[PDB]
Design a protein around this ligand. Sequence first.
Ligand SMILES: *[C@@H]1O[C@H](CO)[C@@H](O[C@@H]2O[C@H](CO)[C@@H](O[C@@H]3O[C@H](CO[C@H]4O[C@H](CO)[C@@H](O)[C@H](O[C@H]5O[C@H](CO)[C@@H](O)[C@H](O)[C@@H]5O[C@H]5O[C@H](CO)[C@@H](O)[C@H](O)[C@@H]5O)[C@@H]4O)[C@@H](O)[C@H](O[C@H]4O[C@H](CO)[C@@H](O)[C@H](O)[C@@H]4O[C@H]4O[C@H](CO)[C@@H](O)[C@H](O)[C@@H]4O)[C@@H]3O)[C@H](O)[C@H]2NC(C)=O)[C@H](O)[C@H]1NC(C)=O
Ligand SMILES: CNC(=O)c1cnc(COc2cc(Cl)c(C#N)cc2C(C)(C)C)n1C
Ligand SMILES: [Ca+2]
Ligand SMILES: [Ca+2]
Ligand SMILES: [K+]
Ligand code: NA
Ligand SMILES: [Zn+2]
Length: 804
Amino acid sequence: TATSGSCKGRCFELQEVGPPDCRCDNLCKSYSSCCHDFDELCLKTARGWECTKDRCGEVRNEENACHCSEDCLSRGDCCTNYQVVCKGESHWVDDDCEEIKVPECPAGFVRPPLIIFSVDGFRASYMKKGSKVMPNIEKLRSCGTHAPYMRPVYPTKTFPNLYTLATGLYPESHGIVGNSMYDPVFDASFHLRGREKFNHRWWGGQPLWITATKQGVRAGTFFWSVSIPHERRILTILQWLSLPDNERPSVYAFYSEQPDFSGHKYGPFGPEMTNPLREIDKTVGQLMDGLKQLRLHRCVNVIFVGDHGMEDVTCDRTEFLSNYLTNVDDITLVPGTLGRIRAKSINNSKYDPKTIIAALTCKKPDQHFKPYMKQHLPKRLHYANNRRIEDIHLLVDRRWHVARKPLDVYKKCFFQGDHGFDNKVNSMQTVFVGYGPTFKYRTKVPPFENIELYNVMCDLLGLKPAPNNGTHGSLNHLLRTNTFRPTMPDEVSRPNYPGIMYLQSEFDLGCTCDDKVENKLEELNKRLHTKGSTKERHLLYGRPAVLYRTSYDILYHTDFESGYSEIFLMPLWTSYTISKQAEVSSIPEHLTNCVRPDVRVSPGFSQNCLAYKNDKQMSYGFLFPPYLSSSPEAKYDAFLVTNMVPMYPAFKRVWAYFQRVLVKKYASERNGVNVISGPIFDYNYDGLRDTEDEIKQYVEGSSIPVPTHYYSIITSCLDFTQPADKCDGPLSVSSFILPHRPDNDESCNSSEDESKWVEELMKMHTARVRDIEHLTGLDFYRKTSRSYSEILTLKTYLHTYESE
Ligand SMILES: *[C@@H]1O[C@H](CO)[C@@H](O[C@@H]2O[C@H](CO)[C@@H](O[C@@H]3O[C@H](CO[C@H]4O[C@H](CO)[C@@H](O)[C@H](O[C@H]5O[C@H](CO)[C@@H](O)[C@H](O)[C@@H]5O[C@H]5O[C@H](CO)[C@@H](O)[C@H](O)[C@@H]5O)[C@@H]4O)[C@@H](O)[C@H](O[C@H]4O[C@H](CO)[C@@H](O)[C@H](O)[C@@H]4O[C@H]4O[C@H](CO)[C@@H](O)[C@H](O)[C@@H]4O)[C@@H]3O)[C@H](O)[C@H]2NC(C)=O)[C@H](O)[C@H]1NC(C)=O
Ligand SMILES: CNC(=O)c1cnc(COc2cc(Cl)c(C#N)cc2C(C)(C)C)n1C
Ligand SMILES: [Ca+2]
Ligand SMILES: [Ca+2]
Ligand SMILES: [K+]
Ligand code: NA
Ligand SMILES: [Zn+2]
């Protein structure tokens, strides 16, 4: 750097000048590249940050941090409280809240500006528990639009979540997969400290500032240097807002290190936390009083958002890998609130993942972490499809840490708070408030995920979002105006509707059934069932649409409808309705091993029983459960070869319990349920439906592909006084994506009765409908009475199974 130039007139300039000139933008600090006079000119502190009676109409003194002189409003650099002190105006927080029906902006303003006010470690329950000391924030919240909480992404760390906020992408896709990383292809290490985290090759996707800039919208800085005080960040934003129309940004960001910084030291609700909350609130008050001075307080959209929460964590709640492994010096642990394990040395081919996992599995009765291969993590975490994510992962229980060895924890108790846990954990939830002309007035919306906000911020700014993991339209209910008008994806493949085309003897599948048992009243009756007479009952929301090119058949049955894939030789989906009144029966003894050819579907597009017999690892289950047949006669339908799917014995324990006990429990509790079940194939763990040439496992000696997962979507009436099959209004859904594993090693209590571990597994693997859509290429809920935006909201819902 040639730091011999000057910042005279360039303080916090918006486009950084190119070396070897010296820099006066607000990253210069972080690159050792500021001009000599940067602090003197750009970081004035004289006389502090508030006008007092005695400074009112003072003579402009340019050494002052901010001004109380008569010309300050026009120069854009008054103290934020100037009008209050010197002109008898009220602080914004003292004014009543008044609906902002239209943007009330100064002339020259082409669009309401957006200000993102992000707060580090701002746990969701602060909104209620700290309400008495955060009057500015509470006004934004009750007068604007707010959720009870906002769900972060995993891991629930700072950089992964702020870059998710800026890109609408999962960390696996944007690349910032933790607060430290190693990247083998670069051979390189990213960390919180140091210079490496500033190289742009870490940062994938297209962040909002780049989306804005490419489309003609100017942006303020998103990164603030740690040595620029909050008061100066606010004044800088308010100065930028007084720039001329051609130079003025439309989007801005402010970031606070608090309350995170204190939360680490004192825990989430430590007595020391009251003051940081007060201070953030005061900052908010400064921004709003500043906006109001500039007549922007009914023009700008403000988003108050957190990156993650904070939990009680102490040194004594640390699990040490040295207590599990003998070989603890052959590994590298990325430690703390998650674990990632790789080999110390890439030249040691005597590193075995399998033995490391087994040595960490169910080894202590109260073990506070669970090892996973990353592809076996819950699909809701979307945490696998990146080379920077180690194959071995430890999911750590809330309130705990994991470390390699004790020396790592004392030759580094300091801390009483931390974060980074599973993003379903209550203590990790954070906040969202939207306030402004474009947000709704005094509106509460349901909790949603921070991946959705990029689309909305783009809407707010009139930008076309780059491709992202949001579901555009799912947050339209936040907005007064600027709604995105989404439409349903076009169906790509039309189904076939086969009739009876094959005689029994044409099949040689090696199946038997005990079913030679032969009436005219109920001969027309069953024909009606195979043409789809009951389909209105079992298919409540329309048939799912297939969004890729393939060959499939719709099959109707008395108790269930299916979309049967000629390519994968099993249903893509199976739909059935179980009313509150329905009865569970058993599989009669004579029908235990019964599998029946489907005369609507050719031998060449059918599974066969001989493959399952020959495959010593692999067994089979059914998508529509025999246990819920409406009649002895209807039960034969459930044993069609077209309803069969490959299942490991270990997995049949889970599936049988779900189908025999849980479906009926849910129907009783929810007043009927509609169930859609099916297979998922994600051998490359990218969260996306595999093509057939990606399948790595088949049922031995066959073309029957083995699913990696099985899903179910379980829908009912949100008003549970109406039965699922006659619901007039909004729906309620829960879903899961269970991993199809040949062991139950994941469940430490799996030697017990299914009543003690199965449901807990299923909860862990709760999913959004949207997650199943990505994994299957299906589009659900195509025919309802609800608006499409409401259905998009429903498809993004996750049932978390946390308490309140
Ligand atoms: C969440 O939303 C995101 C965003 O929409 C979804 O991610 C997209 O998924 C698409 C499908 O997987 C994917 O499209 C592929 O990308 C190739 C072009 O890629 C570059 O350009 C874009 C655009 O500017 C850019 O964003 C990409 O950025 C990635 O890579 C850099 C590092 O290079 C990172 O800085 C960044 O973080 C990002 O990394 C992530 O993505 C890559 C994959 O792109 C992952 O490997 C990483 O782990 C990380 O997650 C890229 O720089 C394109 O070349 C591909 O084309 C192949 O496949 C198609 C199939 O139709 C076919 O036409 C061709 O045959 C072609 O095959 C040839 O190449 C093969 C592989 O080299 C080879 O085997 C063949 O034999 C052939 O030679 C493909 O279109 C898109 O890139 C990403 N976008 C992002 C931002 O991640 C994501 O799916 C959503 N998640 C869910 C769950 O829904
Ligand atoms: C040690 N210093 C820091 O950690 C630091 C300094 N300034 C910031 C704020 O950064 C952001 C803010 C917002 Cl609001 C968004 C969004 N959307 C994105 C970012 C990133 C991190 C992508 C630049 N941080 C985290
Ligand atoms: Ca943080
Ligand atoms: Ca896949
Ligand atoms: K078998
Ligand atoms: Na087990
Ligand atoms: Zn932190």
